Symmetry: D2
Subunit: 364 residues, 4 copies
């Protein structure tokens, strides 16, 4: 039980003879690899990701995105002026974790990013800015500060800046999962967006964003949320109410001074998309979360306030827009200096769907 791969007796060490070396040589020629030389690496005691905890500064991401807006035109082929966060441990792949892409995207004055679709699921999140509409299956969706915008797999999407000012946001996708697992399909759509209109609220929201109500034309459940925009207003109100209810001595917050919501598919009560979980957390000044180990990877973006993250015992100070990744089973906690708002995403739906999820919480 307490034994690990370092301390266990190694009882399968063959005698090193010419017959043994010839056996190993013939394994190579036959595309055979023995378990007994490999076991501890293939099957660790607990997860040990090649990805490392890492933090990217928003100020740095903005500088690089802005310079890219100056030097690189957006359009067909390359599709998006998007910069992926590449984990230092992941071999030069544009993967923030083994399952997820997280990237900054920049659309300059009056630019269009052309329409396409792909089996890969996607969302947009906005720490700051306005001006862009993303048109999802023909339905123009305004992008504003604090909004989560969804683009489920196989939905046509294109983006356009309707103003004379640049805008930046983050993209999350299951690109790394999808590449390694061979589930990717892609289709080019129109070179412009199919609708340039700029309504305040999308058709999706107009049908689906009334609490506890479901259109009779929408009684079929969906694999992904039909809500195209989870607007900041509602997120802000939800979190405030939780802290207000806590004041009044009423259950609501997930832990003391820790308000939090999960963005959900309203047809099921489940996650927004099959591979991706999105959450939003608001911590009271002075709140320190209990340290968690969780299977699978998570990424946060600081939306507002000041604080720190601790990963593997290491404290990193965080500011507005900063992004960090916690790989599988890395102990993590957040510490709020001011009231501390963060946007969160993860691959937890994959882990939970396949019964791989485990959680260790300090004090429990």
């Amino acid at each position: 039980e307490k034994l690990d791969h370092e301390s266990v007796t190694q009882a399968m060490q063959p005698k090193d003879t010419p017959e043994l070396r010839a056996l190993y040589k013939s394994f190579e020629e036959e595309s055979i690899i023995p378990l007994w030389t490999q076991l501890g690496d293939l099957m660790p005691i607990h997860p040990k990701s090649k990805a490392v905890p890492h933090v990217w500064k928003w100020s740095t991401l903005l500088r690089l995105a802005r310079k890219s807006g100056e030097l690189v035109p957006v359009g067909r082929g390359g599709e998006r002026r998007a910069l992926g966060l590449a984990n230092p441990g992941l071999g030069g792949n544009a993967y923030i974790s083994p399952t997820m892409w997280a990237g900054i995207q920049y659309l300059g004055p009056r630019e269009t990013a052309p329409e396409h679709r792909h089996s890969q699921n996607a969302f947009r999140f906005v720490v700051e800015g306005e001006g862009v509409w993303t048109v999802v299956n023909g339905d123009p969706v305004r992008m504003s500060r604090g909004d989560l915008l969804l683009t489920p797999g196989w939905c046509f999407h294109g983006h356009m800046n309707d103003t004379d000012q640049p805008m930046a946001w983050i993209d999350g996708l299951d690109i790394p999962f999808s590449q390694q697992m061979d589930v990717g399909f892609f289709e080019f759509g129109s070179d412009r967006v199919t609708d340039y209109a700029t309504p305040n609220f999308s058709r999706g929201e107009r049908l689906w964003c009334h609490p506890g109500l479901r259109p009779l034309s929408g009684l079929q459940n969906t694999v992904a949320s039909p809500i195209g925009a989870y607007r900041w207003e509602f997120t802000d109100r939800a979190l405030t109410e939780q802290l207000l209810l806590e004041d009044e001595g009423q259950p609501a917050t997930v832990a003391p001074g820790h308000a939090a919501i999960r963005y959900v598919n309203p047809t099921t009560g489940g996650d927004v998309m099959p591979t991706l979980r999105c959450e939003f957390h608001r911590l009271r000044a002075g709140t320190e979360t209990a340290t968690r180990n969780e299977v699978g990877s998570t990424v946060f973006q600081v939306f507002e306030g000041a604080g720190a993250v601790v990963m593997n015992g290491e404290t990193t100070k965080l500011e507005k827009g900063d992004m960090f990744v916690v790989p599988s089973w890395v102990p993590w906690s957040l510490q709020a200096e001011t009231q501390f708002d963060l946007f969160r995403f993860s691959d937890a739906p994959i882990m939970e769907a396949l019964s791989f999820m485990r959680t260790k919480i300090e004090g429990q």
Copy 2:
């Protein structure tokens, strides 16, 4: 296939002899009843309810409720000054249909209706009035015009009029189902309500009424909705948006000029309670719905405007507050003279859960 119980050959007619009569007599003594004398009644070609279509006028219901407020005190024992709509076909039982109670309730100035709970599921709907709070598991819930209020089975509930003016509403319960099926439990609670405070919005709403958002403290799914109030604002907005989207040529309405929503449990996307489905319909002036036959019973209350219902080919003119029941498989349609808003409930979740549901729609 085209044969029915009237036209089929009756091939089990025994010879009427003293031996046969002695056999039938001994069936009675042994508590045995033969199928062959009974078949057509026990197993009809299509449903043939003992309940009949029937309409009750709100003006009449109000008169009787008001007089009851003058002559009958509310309190313990009797519990509620509630008048049940009793279907003429249902043998003197206080059943609007074989599954459902529908009733008018009246609470006068400053009165309290004391706390209790029961396995029977319940909701309140308000065509008109204000002043009452219903306190559900200690959580005061304001009752206003156009609101649906829920009281799932086994939740403690009491009601109090916080003003000097009377209020009336309708109650729906699965009382008849629960009586006939032997599932009823009941417990007396406090003689007053446990909280006299009168907040604008309940704790339940404050956690659960933000579209597409779920508290992390509420990740467990519930058998009934945790939303205690489905406020008129949202219902009205939903219905308007559907008619607006229809104008713009966009799918939304369930049929031409027919906007409609289903009130739902946000943890599942399903019905508010296991036995009871609630809906709200808004018809454009001049809309006539396609005639439907549906398994199980439904009840409507006219919330606003003027129109008619047709049941079994018979037109009945309807006004604000009027209530009608459509028993199982009775052909029904609605005709809007002005824009015509109706609140709807039914036992459809029971039928659908047990795979008994069938639907015939005229033109399909």
Copy 3:
């Protein structure tokens, strides 16, 4: 909490005046019934069925069925020479409980019972006999001692005696539920059965009765089991193995000396049909089950051995073939004198689907 409808203060007793009597008279004229005169009956503290516990002797059921085979021809119209057990508490209805029909059926030498279908779900169980095939959607299904045969709602079924000797079995249906709830449809099929062949095993069994295996042509889940026959061999083997595993000190039996199985839909792991649960119990000699209160009704048939049932504290000695009903919430236990085998059915799937199920077990 400890108050009941007998001991609670009755605080809604109006003054008995001509104005009050005129109010009550006008309730009658308007088809209105007040809650306050009715409450305790409509909403009891715990279930109080109109059905009573009752036992029918197989010797008596056989005598009556045999005499019916002499005096009453089987055929069209009457459809089946079936005798329903009619609960003394259920008003002359051919209902063994408020939800279920339980009946003895008799098919004499060479007789055919013609084909039909109905939304009502059905099963056959055989304490004794052979010779009959029931043809279900064209698929001949042999009927033998100890077999459970299924006939899910809307499946065409007819029965024929292929021998010169009579056979009797029991039928269970959701007839009473279906009548009271208005879900019944019925269709006459062919006057004879569509296939007179008499294979040992049906096509359904040949596809579906291999443990842990599912045909690739059957990947769609079904609302009812596609297994047409649950043969005695497997039931007997299952129960024996549980008692053997218990001997070996291994978990298997549901309680000490109490082996039991539930017949299941193999596509879901759930109940055989939406309204009806079937089980088979085998008790070691000397086993006495802990007393249970359960919501909803259950019926047993003694298949073999000798024992007793206790209901409401009353012991009734039982022999092979005897049948008894336990209405909702009646305390019940079984006592085995010899090894005691019983077939069981109930309306528990209805109760569980609608979250009405409760269970009290003595000692827990």
Copy 4:
């Protein structure tokens, strides 16, 4: 729509200036990778696995396994004398596909392989041999020709040869998925097996292998099958019956002359384990399956008879024991020369759980 990554206009080619090269250099320093240089590789038109179709000959696998039994002792540390099939396209990883390990394992006379558990799900399949018991959570499970044995994640398992003759089998696991996704946990158990007894049938089978029957002590559904052994008898009988039913003109086979089953979890009707689907196929002599493209990877082992596989248009002749892998979206078909039996496994449950599954069938 018809455009691909080769033929699309590349409109994001920046001017190659020192400012651009400095921008790209600073991307490297900041752990940023741009989408626009990467798009076509990250997001292909359809899947394009690094894994290639490949076939391994059983004669070759046996030779290498036998020599390993001579030169390499089995025991602690290395754990298993197992040889993994390593796809030539997968970079030297011991992965037959991106999701699955498939390997030959060899246990010589009287040897024990010691107990352990791991989150990785596993099964054993036997083309030939007898003598080994695998003890799963203390429950000895006989291993015989044609049997599928399961070892769901986190179950303690060890293996022992109870005879004087060697035995070989194949192992399938979700090792590659689990490594790349960081879900692996591992625990060492006892150095020997905890029970050396050698019963014909395990406790799991004795509870769970009776068709359509479920123990009342097992009403809780499981994430993986509780059946530890899917014995050849039942698999053989199922397949025969399908071909017999086809002869009789009755629906059963999945395609003409193509009998097939899926091994299932009896508590749900679903797959044996969350990550792994197992099937068994029997083709009539002369049957050629319609060509399929399927998302995700599959592996077959020829159990009996002679035939061929076609992958990417290439025919490879197959004999008893031979193994082949079809990576994601590779067109594949089987051709039977004699009656042709194959065991199949795949990662299809992962694809279906996450809504990534697509299927193209030739002629449909």
